[PDB]
Design a binder for this molecule. Sequence first.
Ligand SMILES: NC(=O)c1ccc[n+]([C@@H]2O[C@H](COP(=O)([O-])OP(=O)(O)OC[C@H]3O[C@@H](n4cnc5c(N)ncnc54)[C@H](O)[C@@H]3O)[C@@H](O)[C@H]2O)c1
Ligand SMILES: C[C@@H](Sc1nc2c(cnn2C)c(=O)n1-c1ccccc1)c1ccccn1
Ligand SMILES: [Cl-]
Ligand SMILES: [Cl-]
Lengths: 494, 494, 494, 494
Amino acid sequence: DLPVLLTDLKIQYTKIFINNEWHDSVSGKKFPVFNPATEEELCQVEEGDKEDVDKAVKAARQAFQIGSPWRTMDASERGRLLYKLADLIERDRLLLATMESMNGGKLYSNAYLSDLAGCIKTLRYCAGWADKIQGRTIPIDGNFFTYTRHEPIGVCGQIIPWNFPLVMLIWKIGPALSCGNTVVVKPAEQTPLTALHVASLIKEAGFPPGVVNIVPGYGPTAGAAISSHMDIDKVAFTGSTEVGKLIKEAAGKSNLKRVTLELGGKSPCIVLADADLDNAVEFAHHGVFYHQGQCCIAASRIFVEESIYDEFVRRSVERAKKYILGNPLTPGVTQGPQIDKEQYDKILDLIESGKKEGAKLECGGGPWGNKGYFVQPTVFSNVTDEMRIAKEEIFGPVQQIMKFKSLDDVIKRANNTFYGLSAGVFTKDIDKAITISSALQAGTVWVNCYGVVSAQCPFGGFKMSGNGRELGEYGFHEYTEVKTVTVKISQKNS
Amino acid sequence: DLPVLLTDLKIQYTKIFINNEWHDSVSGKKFPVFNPATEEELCQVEEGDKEDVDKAVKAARQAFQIGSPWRTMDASERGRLLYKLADLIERDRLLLATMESMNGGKLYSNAYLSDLAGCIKTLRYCAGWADKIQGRTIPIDGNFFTYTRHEPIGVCGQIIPWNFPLVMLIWKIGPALSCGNTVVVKPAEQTPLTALHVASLIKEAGFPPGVVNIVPGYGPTAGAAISSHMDIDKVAFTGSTEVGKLIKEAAGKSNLKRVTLELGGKSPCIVLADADLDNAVEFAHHGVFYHQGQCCIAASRIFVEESIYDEFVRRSVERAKKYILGNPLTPGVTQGPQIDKEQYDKILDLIESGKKEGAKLECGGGPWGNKGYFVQPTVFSNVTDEMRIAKEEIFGPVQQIMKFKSLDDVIKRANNTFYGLSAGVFTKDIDKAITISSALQAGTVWVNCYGVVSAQCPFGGFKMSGNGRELGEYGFHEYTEVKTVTVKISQKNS
Amino acid sequence: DLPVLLTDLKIQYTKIFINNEWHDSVSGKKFPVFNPATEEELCQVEEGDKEDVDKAVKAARQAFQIGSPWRTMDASERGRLLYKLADLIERDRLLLATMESMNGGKLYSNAYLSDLAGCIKTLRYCAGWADKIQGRTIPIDGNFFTYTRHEPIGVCGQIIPWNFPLVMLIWKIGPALSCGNTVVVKPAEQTPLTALHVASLIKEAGFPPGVVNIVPGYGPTAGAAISSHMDIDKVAFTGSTEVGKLIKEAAGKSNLKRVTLELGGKSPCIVLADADLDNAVEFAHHGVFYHQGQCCIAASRIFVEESIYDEFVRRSVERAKKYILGNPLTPGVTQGPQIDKEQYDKILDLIESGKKEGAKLECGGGPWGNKGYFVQPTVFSNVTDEMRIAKEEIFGPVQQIMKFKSLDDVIKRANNTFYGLSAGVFTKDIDKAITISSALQAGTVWVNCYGVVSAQCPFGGFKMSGNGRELGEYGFHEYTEVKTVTVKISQKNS
Amino acid sequence: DLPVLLTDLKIQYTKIFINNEWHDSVSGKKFPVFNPATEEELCQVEEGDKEDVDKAVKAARQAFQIGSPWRTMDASERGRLLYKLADLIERDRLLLATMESMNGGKLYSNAYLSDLAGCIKTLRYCAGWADKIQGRTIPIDGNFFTYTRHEPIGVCGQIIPWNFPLVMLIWKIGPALSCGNTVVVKPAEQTPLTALHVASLIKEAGFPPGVVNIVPGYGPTAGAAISSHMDIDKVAFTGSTEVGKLIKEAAGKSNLKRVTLELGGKSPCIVLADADLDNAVEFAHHGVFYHQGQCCIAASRIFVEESIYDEFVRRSVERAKKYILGNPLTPGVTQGPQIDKEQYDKILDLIESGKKEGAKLECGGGPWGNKGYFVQPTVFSNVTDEMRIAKEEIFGPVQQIMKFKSLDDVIKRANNTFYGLSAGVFTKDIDKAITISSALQAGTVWVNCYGVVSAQCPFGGFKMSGNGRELGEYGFHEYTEVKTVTVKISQKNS
Ligand SMILES: NC(=O)c1ccc[n+]([C@@H]2O[C@H](COP(=O)([O-])OP(=O)(O)OC[C@H]3O[C@@H](n4cnc5c(N)ncnc54)[C@H](O)[C@@H]3O)[C@@H](O)[C@H]2O)c1
Ligand SMILES: C[C@@H](Sc1nc2c(cnn2C)c(=O)n1-c1ccccc1)c1ccccn1
Ligand SMILES: [Cl-]
Ligand SMILES: [Cl-]
């Protein structure tokens, strides 16, 4: 069942959020926010820059001070607040799913059924950890009592992309807040709206002021101020490789802040001759086409064993021809637009490189419509490893299908990339599932499925797809700072 | 390569071991120890009884006192001592493998290559844990500092069987000593010799006196004194269900000591039509016949899908006809004797019940030789679920093979037992491996193998096969006692 | 603030709860439930016996079957249900706090502010663990893939006392249900009412039928049927040592079910000369007098250093003279009645033994009122270690105060008991806090406080105060059963 | 007891170590290695540069390949090899302690009794972890089986300082090798000799070729090649802040390799009026003067409460006047030289700034001797927070002592630094110990001691003292890469 908002969406929250109050930009400047489906301005939002980030950090630092409400409150109460924020997002699900769709070009049914559900479930997951973050007592050599405190780090700068605005906000703030950090969030300039609504709910839920601060604005201004800030203890980021590089450099030059990045992928699937063929086709298809291909985990290289390759290509092409393009709010629409001009241009340029480099165009290969940044769903077969479409993240509805005959060789080809976010293995054989998944240099390997993401699992890249893990037990480690306390005693006993 | 002891085995250690010294029994009585292959007495050993156990417990209690060497020494030094004991067992490997074979009726090549290697590796594993046993710091509600100490329990009584004398000694003392407990060990009356040699090495390695005490003797005397002792904090046991019951009752009536038991099994294998047939035959065969069938994990019910059942039965029978019986010290001998008369009698009685109840005798079915407790390796096909050989632990070289056609039904049949120590699943299908292994009520489930036991894995029973786990990270929990320390403070911070 | 129920309490739930429906007893018999303050019957409740327990176990077994809703649902949804049950208990807090007070003789302000808050917070804590109960992947020797499943155990019988009916219900069902077990709960015959209300909320919250079953009734009938049941996998118990012994024996003789017990204490405090005297007096006082002394953790031996002993005794006596006895529902009443005649008789008998054995009666020492099982708050000074009041759990408002001069000696005296549930240490010295707390053989040691119990901490006894731990990360281990799955692979890699 | 090498030290290992063989530099160039006590050349060593690092990385990559000996061997055997390397270092303790002293200007008794013991114990600690590095099985939403592999990362570049050459080598390679990584180590140009000896023992112990590669050489050449290498997965570093910054930038610009740094400190002690004064004086003294002040953890700001300040200053000054300078190999010598000219110059420049800025010179304040880089042990009192000696890491025998009157204020002053490696708290009060240690932004806080470092504890900086932790359970996380494997199944059960 797919309920809808029964009156038109009214945008209310357009300001910078610091110390639980709404601020105008220091400069006074505002910037437009667009609907990618119509190319029309939805509203203007206060443009945060260095001076606004500086205010947010000061508020975040003050909220983190020893003796403050956020530091002294029970861990269990930090969890209570997170479960309350999840209840409120659940309350405003229709509103939030609609705003997400409209601002982000995101199909409404997915926004409502997947993104909103993921936000709610991830917050509830992170809430449960708050009073289960524990240190150790350690049987050190000598007459000492040694324990560790897994403290919060402090002020965490969190720079967020436009492809999953709300989900990415919750992935960042959920763990950070559960561990007792304070945060300065910079949403994507394309998609600040859902973040600012959530900030209203952070106030309503009763989080102490300055625990969450939200500074909408642009990357080289507000983002760079975060990356280079002398009093931000950690920056976490999801987005491009280029910006990731800029962030680590700025961090290195400023205060050696802790950095975790999640960057692109060129995630491969390996489909063995014994694979459930329909299952492999359907998961690989959704693996590459989900949200107009605008997923870090996009299954953008699909290697299929020769004897089933032509059948795989045939079935995949027929699957890609079934989409209905248009406004992501209209029921029955199954493909929305790309987020903006820059991404639109990149996808089309890469599609053209694929034609020019001699890949076989099975379907699509051009733009669509009189308005909106729509790209036809596009399939290429006979793709080889040195083509631009085999090497570069497209972030569009563009599927690459390749044949292999040698399993040793295709593992090498799958691993022959600076990326490593994820991969997929399709086979019925137990030994092959285990050995192949172990050999792939990828952070998540799916077996006979793809794109299965849940709050209980750590998620992150190998190699230049990033560093560190998010979510799961393991992800919570990177939002703590370990302190060893060692006390001289007269005599220790076991 | 299989080296041998180049001179005859001379038995030296025959006394009770308490406070690192050799004691005569309080009574003055001694008991015979036999070689099951010849039925000849090897030596006499001091017979421990209540009074001797009482001395051992007093020594173990004194060694556990706050301020004592064993309580105050570095955890890392407890580990150092365990690695040294492993070095010494490695030094005396030939001696120990020979003594084990001679006293226990255990094939020498297995005693040397498997049992001795298992002892050495398990001690080294347990050594590594000593200074990695850690408590927690806990973010309790209110203004308090709360930590936990995972302390040793105290004096642990450890009652050991005759089928793996040395391995079972190390499985018991390794974890207990690594966690900082002191122990009172009662070896099987049939097989005290290797334990007393190891006690000599415990002295030589430099363990503080009274940390390990070894009281050879009988079950209703020395064993019952341990189970009912008012100052033994925990009893751990491997052996019969009957004795397990006696131990828990005695424990319940005395001082509510912590009890962990490992008892029989009637461990089932399920062989699917798609299984690698030779692999399944070879592992199921070794699964049931290992050490003359005298293993808790014996694969004593083998369920095979109808379409491959007759082939499975054929191949298994030909495998069982390949043994050479005789003295377990002679190279090329592949089956030694059963441990003693009682076990011999039980096996033969159960073989006769199988014939009388209408099971199909494929091979074997009687005794062998003029001397030693030898039983022919015996295979029964067309076994049904209400036969004695399907329900009762045989502890002999007696293999039961059964057909099934419905997978739902055979899972039910495999689970239809009060036992639950282990099981095996043979299939190439990923989904079947996972779903079947999850559905089996068994402590260890092997997939496309059997009898794979290593120090890194917890091991223990579901249901009446016992309680608690041994070895692995998880096993170490049951040799600690958790103490929560909660300290009032003026103000806590995260 | 202390709100109250604005209309009279109407009792609704009086039946056996099995498969989410209300059953009459098989026999047809019912038993009375009394208010200990008035000695008047509140209502009649269906009397569960063996036949009813047998129905509950069958329902619990069916709900635990592979493929059932409770086994297949997301762990996170098990958690969701527990958070919902906590929301409902919060909704009915006034009702439940009132019923608890009326049935249990429990002061209403404590019932409302402490017990109800503890139930709610503990359920929310246990909810958070559900989808964080994890196994391991293990680098076993040889070419194998080994993982562990921390499965639920199965059907858990849970036998509950009358002193904290609601808190004890939640301590039992919260962890068990979070781990995915099904339960058969037997509330105390004195106090079934709050449990049956909670069962109504279990239905309303939407727990699958047969996941929680509640069989009110008596100990030697319904309780013994649980302890001796051939298809209950684990029994957990809080209550007397005598019954604990009966449970382990019955368990041993039947199906070797896993048993965890929490039994009495004779918990000591050690007050050093440098202690904050008022702090130590106030915590030791509340430590022994809380809930009419009817707490397992009662601080029933208080050892005070000679130089501050007379001042400690003086201040404690004046503190004990400040109570107002009467109906626990009336605002300003600070001491309610004892639960029943048996406990009343025991307390008074023990008070008389203290007078006869030459302890110094400072205040109290007799009954109070024309109705209700009230005992005057009683203080004894100059108590010595062989008096009955020094050795035996009183479970009444009876405080024992003792002098010491040697710290070595008083640690010995504090440890000289078969009990070991808890202890308290009062000092300003860092080294003394650490060394004394380490040396005490007690499951929880408080430093400069007492009776600080929270859901994040494991809680349980050393020695004859019980086995196993409840709550905290550590407590969740005892509601799982570890299964090792080891899969043969062609080649493993690190 | 302090044994000595009975014949003169002969230097043997002077070459680059790659694939367990000794290589000349590609260039052919060699560089001198000096004894800081005499300023005399000990030998010439092959100078590694980019081309040699490139060879080492290729060897390390080949050793890490799926299917290789190092990837396929049992975890327990990786541990076995580490325990063997520790046995060999123990065998060559005299040799290694002597070489360390001679090359590093390190007192021989400390080199033998502390450094060598630390190497041996840390290797044995890391050995014990190898087969206890475990992933998880995770109860993910939906019908999936999800586990994690904590794999090794891959090729780890490890850049090592000159102050603890051998200890720092073992701190780096022990965890990395235990987790299954391969390494490219660059020792300090000042101190390559002990590393090259250990490489000989790595060969002798039987580590597969290319698992450990050692490239001696200079920082901007060999070091920069490591930091900027496109096929090194992680760089770990201990040294200056400046180089740390260079490493993160180079890493950022090249392949976004994982970086962990340990950098300087300006570690403060807070001494309360109630502190054991002699204990605080002795630990603070050794805290700042250990190894000629050339420790990252140097207690280089000592804040003492006014009422005991003059007594503290008096006792500290008399302690500092007791040293005997000279050759670190001569028995009775208690202070050796600084490592080299650059460090010598910095210390003397900073001493002069302290005089010029108006700090009170109590003793020392100049160079010593005709040869060697000796600095007199120097104490400054009345130091204020804006002096260079209060702000900058000296890395010399220069002690700063300061008064405070307000505890709130001195915590602020202690935390008022971009550093944060460690701190010390001296008090008898339980509450003050806990609250102060919690409030200090430092990675290790010692209470009533200082400089207590053991293998069981994580160690690392807050703020610009670095990122990540070394040693302890927690440190092992940063030498793994987590892979989530999620497998579609037909139906999951709990
Ligand atoms: N640990 C605690 O918190 C606690 C709680 C209650 C009582 N006690 C101690 O026990 C003493 C006696 O009190 P009690 O008699 O009410 O406690 P009890 O142990 O008899 O009763 C507690 C629970 O055990 C059940 N029970 C009784 N007999 C049983 C049997 N044969 N088999 C199975 N279950 C049975 C009861 O019905 C109740 O549900 C008290 O004076 C006190 O010292 C301790
Ligand atoms: C209400 C308390 S429990 C509790 N609180 C107590 C006791 C004495 N004083 N106080 C304040 C006591 O014995 N108990 C107790 C302990 C074990 C078993 C039964 C009762 C609580 C809080 C938080 C979480 C879950 N429980
Ligand atoms: Cl486990
Ligand atoms: Cl714990």
